[PDB]
From a paper:
For this purpose, we choose the hexameric [name] (BsPNP233) from the model specie [name], which displays great biotechnological potential to produce NAs, including the antiviral drug ribavirin.
The base moiety of adenosine (Ado) binds to the BsPNP233 active site in a very similar fashion to that seen in homologous PNPs. In sulfate/phosphate free complexes of hexameric PNPs with Ado, an O4′–exo conformation is usually found. Since the side chain of Arg43* participates in phosphate binding, the presence of this co-substrate and the hydration of the active site probably prevent the interaction between Ado 5′-OH group and Arg43* side chain observed in BsPNP233-Ado complex favoring the ribose to adopt a C4′–endo conformation.
Numbering used by the authors:
A (entry chain B), C (entry chain B), E (entry chain B): 2 to 160, 163 to 232
B (entry chain A), D (entry chain A), F (entry chain A): 2 to 232
Amino acid sequence: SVHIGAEKGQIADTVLLPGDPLRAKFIAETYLENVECYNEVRGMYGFTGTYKGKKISVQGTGMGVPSISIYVNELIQSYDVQNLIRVGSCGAIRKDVKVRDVILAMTSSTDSQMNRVAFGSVDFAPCADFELLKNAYDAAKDKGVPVTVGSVFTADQFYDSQIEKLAKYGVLGVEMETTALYTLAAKHGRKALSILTVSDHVLTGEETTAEERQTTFHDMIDVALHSVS
Amino acid sequence: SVHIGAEKGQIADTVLLPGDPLRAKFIAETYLENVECYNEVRGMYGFTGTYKGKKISVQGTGMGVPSISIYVNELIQSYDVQNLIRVGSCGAIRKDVKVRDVILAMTSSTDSQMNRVAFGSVDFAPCADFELLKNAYDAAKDKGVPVTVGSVFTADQFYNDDSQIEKLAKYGVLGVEMETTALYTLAAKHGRKALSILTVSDHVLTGEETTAEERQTTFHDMIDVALHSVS
Amino acid sequence: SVHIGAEKGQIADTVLLPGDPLRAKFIAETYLENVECYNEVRGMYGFTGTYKGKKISVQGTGMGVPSISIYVNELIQSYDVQNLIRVGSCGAIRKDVKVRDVILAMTSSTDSQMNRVAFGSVDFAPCADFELLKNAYDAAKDKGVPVTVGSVFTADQFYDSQIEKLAKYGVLGVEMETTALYTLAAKHGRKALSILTVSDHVLTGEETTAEERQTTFHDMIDVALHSVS
Amino acid sequence: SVHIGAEKGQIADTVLLPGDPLRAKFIAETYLENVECYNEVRGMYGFTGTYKGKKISVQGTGMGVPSISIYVNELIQSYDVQNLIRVGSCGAIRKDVKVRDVILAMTSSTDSQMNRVAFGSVDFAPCADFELLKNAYDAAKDKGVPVTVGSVFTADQFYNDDSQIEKLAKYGVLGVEMETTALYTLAAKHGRKALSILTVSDHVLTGEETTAEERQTTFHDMIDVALHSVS
Amino acid sequence: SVHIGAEKGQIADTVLLPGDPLRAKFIAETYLENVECYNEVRGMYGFTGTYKGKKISVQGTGMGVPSISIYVNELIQSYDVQNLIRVGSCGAIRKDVKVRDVILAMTSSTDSQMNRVAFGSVDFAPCADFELLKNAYDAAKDKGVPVTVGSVFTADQFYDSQIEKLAKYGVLGVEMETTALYTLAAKHGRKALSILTVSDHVLTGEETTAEERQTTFHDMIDVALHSVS
Amino acid sequence: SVHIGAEKGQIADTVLLPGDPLRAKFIAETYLENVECYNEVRGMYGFTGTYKGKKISVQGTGMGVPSISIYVNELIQSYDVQNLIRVGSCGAIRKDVKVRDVILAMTSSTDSQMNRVAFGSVDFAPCADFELLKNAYDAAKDKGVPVTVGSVFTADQFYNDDSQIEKLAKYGVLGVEMETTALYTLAAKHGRKALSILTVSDHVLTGEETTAEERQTTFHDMIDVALHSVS
Ligand SMILES: Nc1ncnc2c1ncn2[C@@H]1O[C@H](CO)[C@@H](O)[C@H]1O
Ligand SMILES: Nc1ncnc2c1ncn2[C@@H]1O[C@H](CO)[C@@H](O)[C@H]1O
Ligand SMILES: Nc1ncnc2c1ncn2[C@@H]1O[C@H](CO)[C@@H](O)[C@H]1O
């Protein structure tokens, strides 16, 4: 695959997808045993290790629909990946989404044109694989890890209009990857889920503290890993 | 309200929404105790009864986004309805979607322009209330009712020469109906809880039909799951 | 046909299309001789009787483009109907549309996506069959029944934006069916017309009285029936 | 106004709008008494004369929505024109539309973005003033001029590889031209009366051409109907 | 060709395209030797003469995308034209565009639907032929003729919204033809350029004087002619 | 700024923008004197050095409109960057576009919805700053570096089953990449100067690949033109 420097058999059937390749390194080095780096192409690191006997890969995606679409498509078509789990942050857009909540995205809205390019007059609604979702939910509920299940918004432009309106329709937060993941996974018959923590409140400008972030990042990765193994 | 002839207090917190008002009569009379008809306007019948210590209402919605939108808006704004559960059918668009499966719709695609009118360049993904969806899932699992959780397509044209159900199937979409996008959107807008529970009435892309007996089974399974889920 | 329980030959070549199936029953029972009910499917009643020797059917359509599209398509493809006349109400959006005017719709604007689904970048303008229209107009003018001829708006959402703008372009009123009727009739080479009365003024909130409604409903049905026979 | 060099009072209440300014000269000089040319700007000629006790003006519009929009806007806003009647040709897109038929356009479809720019998610259907359309119909019937009443397609691209005239024909659309949507929209916006009367110059979907003599006949029939309709 | 009354060989390989056919006559009669008029169809004059040995044609286009599209398509397909140069005016939309600047359009934005009809979900960006552009630029710079190189807006509706926004994105001015010229030329592998003078400032309402217009019109035609010969 | 960990004064006026942060390291270390790395956030490296008496910065942008938009916005708004030059590759979509040609993008088409979100019914054509484009052209000509000036297509989907690169090629579009529309749009919005200089990495519509040696040559030619153009 053009953007991934891996040999046959170097990437697991289950891949965690953080946006930041340095966070990919962090997750692998912190949570996994017998870690190997199978990709340094573009400095977008991919690693493979084991977690409680299960082979797991962790692959940086970059930011935005186009960047994640590249890596998801190559992981699927070139490396036969089956389960794809984004582990990221989002900006919360409602006050009832709390700083410690781990969010499981059922679906995502978008202003990306990726689907209108495919479907024209059809509004395509991306969907998480329910088995992965319910396994993640059960993993959180098993521990007492606070979890909220709803929809997100996949934005094409980091730097406001209608986020305001989307919040009024109960949308939980904004990030830049989920629509692409969910759509491409489903198109190839693979399983996908996006697990998200809150990096801030965008409407009130209320940031989260570094300590709060460290805790929720742990809960997120633990949920991702517990649910597949 | 203009389309529902009910006095305040006649409609329950929790409302099942078949498309067919004759099916609403059937549901209410078969499953519920001490049933009153509260609406006869346009023959779009609505009934209220009790199921295991709880008020349940059953309101026909009619067919298509605009029709169900009217009923859902009025139920929410004039009758303070909290929980809205569509109980209906869809045409399966994948072979792997079996005739016995009860479908729980996480989300719905659409060719309705209802959301584009509101959202412009935003593809709005409508979303089921997860609490209701999980309760329905659990109640199916409790009984062993076969269940599949995924997305549907909310079509504006039952008969469509320009149909892209072929493409939507390749993206894993389970089935086609005509109401869900509207239900999910309008409930979410007013902070109310919504879910669509669907049976399969045929496979659109093979033409293949289900038997009358098969439809009876799965309808029962669907209403059972629906009522047990809200207790 | 899936949604219509009629035997071969039970439905006339000319069908009146009220939205309300109870109004379908009312029209049939009040205006027609030797009435039979050929459809109770979904409680969306269809009846056939005679008016001055001519066989006439009256079929409920329900509300909205999708619902009428079903019944029009089945009446055309399964029952070979030739002339399709909607008899309904609309909300008037201009002050010069009076409470007693019977409206004949030449065409209709819409926010339904039904045509953009078919035509993409093309704005399709639905058109009434002129023969039916001119026959209706002549029937009204013959009696002195007040009639206004122009365009309407076919709305997808009963519960404002741009109705305001449409009024400024001379559009007469708002209803929820005409675009579908006109488009599907023309597509199958059949004849269609929508005859409408005023249920209220939407911009001023000015309602019509029950007596005013009863009179105009009579004038509308009499025009529909006089023009085909 | 910027595109019409007329002084106030030189333009009549009632204006015929050929696309071709040389045809405007022909109409005015052949049919009208005591004719003045009131505009030479861009060679888009405009003439005023009399027909049976009434002032009539004849203004070339040029080709396409943007061009006719300029003339129509200026005629309305600067010259208080009340009645605007396009007299022109279209290509037939159906076999059942005959070369001798004068077309009266009830409405027009378009691939122009002019209305989407204004109306967003609304498909605006432009509409002829019924009084003018009925007067034209009556004047044709009075003479036995063959007439067909229906819709046309207002195209932005005379030459179009991506053309959907095939589909528009299956929906009963009669013919293709390049002006009507603009005329009908802009007149309606300013509360003025508009109508397009059209002859058939060929069948686009067979390629088949009309003779010069056939075009002469039908042009006469069209102008006759037009002038007799306004008396 | 339907709209052009020319015999084979009457139109040069290089055509100047003013919007006004009277300006076509003016340019030909003033700048060219041995002038012939090859087209009077619709009074949309086309002329052919010589400039310093080079055969040159000057063809009126009319106003708007549809009108220019007709003449460009026939000049290309029926008369094999190679180089097509619009010589027109635009309304300047920025204060830094001066009344004496000759504008060379690199590209143009539009609210014409012509390209969305072709490309659907794609924003097509029309492009001037760089060879013609750079030759024009060098011709101006050779003389000291003031020249500004950027983008324009091709409007479908002479009689405001977003012109305001387009100015903020550095767009220079508004006219009604360039998108069509650039798109159709490129589609047929031919060379196109639009050279423009300022007829006024649209935002401040500041008009140019007749003398200023006469000077810039001369500079524009001289640049068009000098650059091809 | 949130994505760039630089203190004020560490980023130059003039910034080269490769997509690949490892290529930014390569450019800065190969071509520049006294280089500092000013950013390590997300491993999207950014370097500042000197070239012939001028500060030059080299910042990885990542792949696609949303990614480069973040970097470009932050460079402009937080670091007062004046000149932004993308140095990268594209896939050729025409046979007449040769592997050795350095491309200077006058404008870019896109299937990104970024401008439609802003502009509605307007097709926004983004535009290179002509001064920068002309300086690059001149510096290529000064050396005899083969150069082609034209448009590209900025794609949202590297892998696209619904691709219209076939049609875009017939309109003379030279090549496909994933960044230019964003660069040109956002620079123009903030009154800054932008240009994209591109090498060809293969022909997408024949499949045909360039050699490693050919890619080395043309990369050198591109960076040479880029640095010589800003002096
Ligand atoms: N194949 C199908 N296509 C569309 N709607 C269907 C189908 N099967 C069942 N339905 C549902 O049944 C109704 C019409 O019979 C629609 O409201 C729709 O919701
Ligand atoms: N086949 C046709 N296609 C498009 N326009 C036509 C056709 N026939 C006649 N016209 C009219 O004639 C003009 C161009 O000759 C256009 O303005 C258009 O209004
Ligand atoms: N054929 C191609 N299609 C899309 N992007 C390409 C191609 N060749 C090079 N690129 C550029 O390289 C990057 C991905 O390798 C993209 O950011 C894009 O800008």
